Design an enzyme around this catalytic site. Structure first.
Site: not given
Ligand SMILES: Nc1nc2c(ncn2[C@@H]2O[C@H](COP(=O)(O)OP(=O)(O)OP(=O)(O)O)[C@@H](O)[C@H]2O)c(=O)[nH]1
Ligand SMILES: Nc1nc2c(ncn2[C@@H]2O[C@H](COP(=O)(O)OP(=O)(O)OP(=O)(O)O)[C@@H](O)[C@H]2O)c(=O)[nH]1
Ligand SMILES: [Ca+2]
Ligand SMILES: [Mg+2]
Ligand SMILES: [Mg+2]
Lengths: 440, 420, 67
Positions: A10-11, A15, A71, A143, A146, A183, A252, A254
């Site tokens: 998603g957006q 981004q 989209e 979204g 999302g 949302e 990470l 650990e």
């Protein structure tokens, strides 16, 4: 090996993905065409940066990434923008019609038409990995894509890749930049359906980022570009241990061992410092002690909540740049004598520390000062449940009247899915309460 | 992506044509269909409303319908009349004589299939049709009766697409034609069941604005339509220019319509200027295009669109200030129910403007006013033979009235509802 | 001990497969139930619309059989 595949949905996911990959290129000396002159192994290698980039025989360094949106307009900017040569066209996947801020459309009506194609493309990336570690999934809560498409994808990934780890970066809604009234519905539906499919999820509250941009960067009215550049620095801090070598680097995974005491309690609070403008950083160097102490200022957290009124189950400090253990330990000792750091009685109180020596980078035209040293704290605190409480309350207000519910029912959803999701969130809030109670 | 536009009857075609004039100017499209603008923002979402033909010509995705031929002559001679596709003009001979039953059941039924042939041809070549907008009045026969028929037939063929109307509600202050309240009640009965979103453009309010506020002693259709075209430009800005909020018809519906029947919006516009002033005026009863006092009800949802170069910080602060100082007028059980967009491109002849779209329970005042006029005639069965002569029963009038009274009660129910 | 070692690793295999299986069947049940619900919603809408076309025919007949 140890490859990590990033999936941007998603957006918001897309981004943020653009900002993260741009930053990773700068950190590793990868040009917008994908060339990396410092990499002397042409067409392959098992360097630390190969966890995130594959290599073609022509020397191109290609993000191990899929971008997916329902989209085409956001992903079309990636296709025509600065880093367009970075990505093979098959990594950038778009439909024609979005989820219209409706979980049900992203998960079912529109999402179903593209899910097989997306899994096919992810599979192509997985087949090129010799030791795939897992997935990093970037998306909004709010979204339709999302929320709903991400849930569908996470469910399908558990089927196709079993217990292979899946980590999230999840954008939690704020009113200053939100685009839909529903949302809170979408956030509870996705959190419920994804909870068993995610090993660890880093929530980023847009309101916290928005406030940090206003208060510390002096940005009057932050845009997504402002928010995303800051988010990308936090993401980069978290992933730096997978992408760089060094003797004090701590993977990470650990940190994850310490951050996740029970599978449902998998939501760390990130706090990042220093976030400072160039005009304020000039002739004012921030020391290890100063940046570390800033990790316990709630105003620097990625999620608004108050850790001084919950309990810690873990604290991890991820440093980057000019930082040696001696200064870390002296900074920690000072902080323990001065602050409201109360652990639950069943966890040990030692802070776990990693240091990567490669200093932080910034993007040209950015708002952040370039600094010699930075830190991301990842804490497992009961206070993060406040973010769930705020969202759950907004859900209740609307759901008691069934406001907007017909939009979801019209796409084939039942009311029973709403209340099932809501009860899973009530039980989650309750879990967070129970883990902070003393042992009898 | 694509929207298909339909304009029906005299009112629908007059406000329709002005809409195309005003937006063609905002997008830099001249009457021949050539682009002669200064900015890529004008062309980026041009395909929402315009098809591209050979020679880089832009042709409105627009269908022009009436039972009276001659409205076709006047549109075709209007300033932008050459821009429309010639095959998209679909006209009968008869007229409907201000009779909804002629529009809906007899004369309009005869013509409806040829309108659908054009709808289908426009729809077939859409990359991804979002839906339909219809411009019409509710007080005559063609826009009202035939327009609501078209809606119903379109919905059968495109049941998963969005249906949007700009529906001009009658007032004795503008037309003295006595059967208008019948035609409007019968139409509202249709709209309640078959549109997703309806902009109530009230001739009462347009008149009161021209008279009281703009000081026009004798408002013409041209003066009323100047308000309608500024409103229509405003409420479609988010569809037509790049942007975050309400960027397509479905996302707008999802933000604005909490219960499927309660989809009748009160538009507003300002000015009829500082950011505090736009903001106060856009929420003022005197700036609303439906003659309803929003302080006599509560807002379920609101979209606010600011246009022009201004401080986004100041816009955010003022939007927050109106909500805080007027909190009792926004329902507490829909959090964050006011959304704000800012577009840099102002309308023609203004540096700054604000367009308001409100889903307010005060809209019940419009329906009650129509309901009162309906009953005053219906209780004596006055003028009914015009409708029974086309095959309609009294029962259909009783049901339409009852359904519009239910819509009123529903708006009242959510107004009285509380969080606790 | 060797037999205990074999049971631990089979138990792990069994639980992972069982997780995959249950997630596969849950998803398939949801997508089916959603398809049927959406189709039933659309079929009811079409059915109300067909009833209108039927009623419009009774109107043109009432008018024909008036004269
Ligand atoms: N930080 C950040 N948040 C964003 C961005 N874009 C959108 N959001 C937030 O994400 C939520 C809206 O969801 P989006 O990601 O735009 O929607 P989507 O996933 O494309 O879903 P649909 O458009 O409904 O199909 C809101 O809370 C926005 O504030 C972004 O670039 N950065
Ligand atoms: N605001 C506005 N209202 C109009 C205009 N033209 C007509 N009306 C109103 O529309 C209603 C009458 O409907 P018309 O559109 O003229 O009738 P029609 O749809 O063409 O139907 P018939 O003429 O009966 O076949 C009355 O309330 C008029 O005041 C206009 O240009 N602007
Ligand atoms: Ca190499
Ligand atoms: Mg989107
Ligand atoms: Mg006429």
């Amino acid at each position: 090996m140890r490859e990590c595949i990033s999936i941007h949905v998603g957006q918001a996911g897309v981004q943020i993905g653009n900002a993260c990959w741009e930053l990773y290129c700068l950190e590793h000396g990868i040009q917008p065409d994908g060339q990396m002159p410092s990499d002397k192994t042409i067409g392959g290698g098992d360097d630390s940066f190969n966890t995130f980039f594959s290599e073609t025989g022509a020397g191109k360094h290609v993000p191990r990434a899929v971008f997916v949106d329902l989209e085409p307009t956001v992903i079309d900017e990636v296709r025509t923008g600065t880093y367009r040569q970075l990505f093979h066209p098959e990594q950038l996947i778009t439909g024609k019609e979005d989820a219209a801020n409706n979980y049900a459309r992203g998960h079912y009506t529109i999402g179903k038409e593209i899910i097989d194609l997306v899994l096919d493309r992810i599979r192509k990336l997985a087949d090129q990995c010799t030791g795939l570690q897992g997935f990093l999934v970037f998306h909004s809560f709010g979204g339709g894509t999302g929320s709903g498409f991400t849930s569908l994808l996470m469910e399908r990934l558990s089927v196709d890749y079993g217990k292979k780890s899946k980590l999230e970066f999840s954008i939690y809604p704020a009113p200053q930049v939100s685009t839909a009234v529903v949302e809170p519905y979408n956030s509870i539906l996705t959190t419920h359906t994804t909870l068993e499919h995610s090993d660890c999820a880093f929530m980023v509250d847009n309101e916290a980022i928005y406030d940090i941009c206003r208060r510390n960067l002096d940005i009057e009215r932050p845009t997504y570009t402002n928010l995303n550049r800051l988010i990308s620095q936090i993401v980069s801090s978290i992933t730096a241990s997978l992408r760089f070598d060094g003797a004090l680097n701590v993977d990470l995974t650990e940190f994850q061992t310490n951050l996740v005491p029970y599978p449902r309690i998998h939501f760390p609070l990130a706090t990042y410092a220093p976030v400072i403008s160039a005009e304020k950083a000039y002739h004012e160097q921030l020391s290890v002690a100063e940046i570390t102490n800033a990790c316990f200022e709630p105003a620097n957290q990625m999620v608004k909540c108050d850790p001084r009124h919950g309990k810690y189950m873990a604290c991890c400090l991820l440093y980057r740049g000019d930082v040696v253990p001696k200064d870390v330990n002296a900074a920690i000792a000072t902080i323990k004598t001065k602050r409201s750091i109360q652990f639950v009685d069943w966890c040990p109180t030692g802070f776990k520390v990693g240091i990567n020596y490669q200093p932080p980078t910034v993007v040209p035209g950015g708002d952040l000062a370039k600094v010699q040293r930075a830190v991301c704290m990842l804490s497992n605190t009961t206070a993060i449940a406040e973010a769930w409480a705020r969202l759950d309350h907004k859900f209740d207000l609307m759901y008691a009247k069934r406001a907007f519910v017909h939009w979801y029912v019209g796409e084939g959803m039942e009311e029973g899915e709403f209340s099932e999701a809501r009860e899973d969130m009530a039980a989650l809030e309750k879990d967070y309460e129970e883990v902070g109670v003393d042992s009898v | 992506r694509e929207i298909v536009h339909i304009q029906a009857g005299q009112c629908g075609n007059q406000i329709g044509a002005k809409f195309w004039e005003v937006i063609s100017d905002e997008h830099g499209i001249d009457p021949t269909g050539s682009y002669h603008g200064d900015s890529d923002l004008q062309l980026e979402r041009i395909n929402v409303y315009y098809n591209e033909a050979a020679g880089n010509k832009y042709v409105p995705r627009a269908i022009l319908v009436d039972l009276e031929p001659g409205t076709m002559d006047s549109v075709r001679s209007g300033p932008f009349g050459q821009i429309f596709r010639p095959d998209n003009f679909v006209f009968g001979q008869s007229g409907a004589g201000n009779n909804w039953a002629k529009g809906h059941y007899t004369e309009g039924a005869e013509l409806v299939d040829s309108v659908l042939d054009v709808v289908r041809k426009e729809s077939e070549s859409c990359d991804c049709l979002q839906g339909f907008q219809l411009t019409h009045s509710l007080g005559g026969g063609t826009g009202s009766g035939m327009g609501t028929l078209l809606i119903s037939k379109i919905r059968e063929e495109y049941p998963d697409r969005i249906m949007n109307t700009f529906s001009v509600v009658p007032s004795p202050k503008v037309s003295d034609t006595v059967v208008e309240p019948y035609n409007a009640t019968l139409s509202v009965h249709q709209l309640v069941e078959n549109t997703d979103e309806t902009y109530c453009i009230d001739n009462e309010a347009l008149y009161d604005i021209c008279f009281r506020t703009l000081k026009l002693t004798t408002p013409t259709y041209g003066d009323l339509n100047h308000l309608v075209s500024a409103t229509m430009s405003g409420v479609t800005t988010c569809l037509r220019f790049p942007g975050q909020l309400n960027a397509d018809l479905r996302k707008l519906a999802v933000n604005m319509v909490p219960f499927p029947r309660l989809h009748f919006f009160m538009p507003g516009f300002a000015p009829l200027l500082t950011v505090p002033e736009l903001t106060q005026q856009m929420f003022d009863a005197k700036n609303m295009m439906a003659a309803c006092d929003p302080r006599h009800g509560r807002y379920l949802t609101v979209a606010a669109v600011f246009r022009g170069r201004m401080s986004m910080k100041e816009v955010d602060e003022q939007m927050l200030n109106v909500q805080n100082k007027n909190s009792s007028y926004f329902v507490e059980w829909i959090p964050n129910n006011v959304k704000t967009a800012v577009c840099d491109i102002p309308p023609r002849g203004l540096k700054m403007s604000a367009t308001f779209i409100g889903n307010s329970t005060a809209i019940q005042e419009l329906f009650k006013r129509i309901s009162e006029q309906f009953t005053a005639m219906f209780r004596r069965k006055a003028f009914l033979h015009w409708y029974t002569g086309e095959g309609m029963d009294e029962m259909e009038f009783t049901e339409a009235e009852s359904n519009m009274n239910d819509l009123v009660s529903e708006y009242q129910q959510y107004q009285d509802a509380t969080a606790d | 001990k060797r037999e205990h070692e074999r049971e631990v690793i089979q138990k792990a295999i069994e639980e992972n497969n069982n997780f995959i299986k249950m997630a596969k069947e849950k998803l398939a049940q949801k997508m089916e139930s959603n398809k049927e619900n959406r189709e039933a919603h659309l079929a009811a809408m079409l059915e109300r619309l067909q009833e209108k076309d039927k009623h419009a025919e009774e109107v043109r007949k009432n008018k024909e059989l008036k004269e």
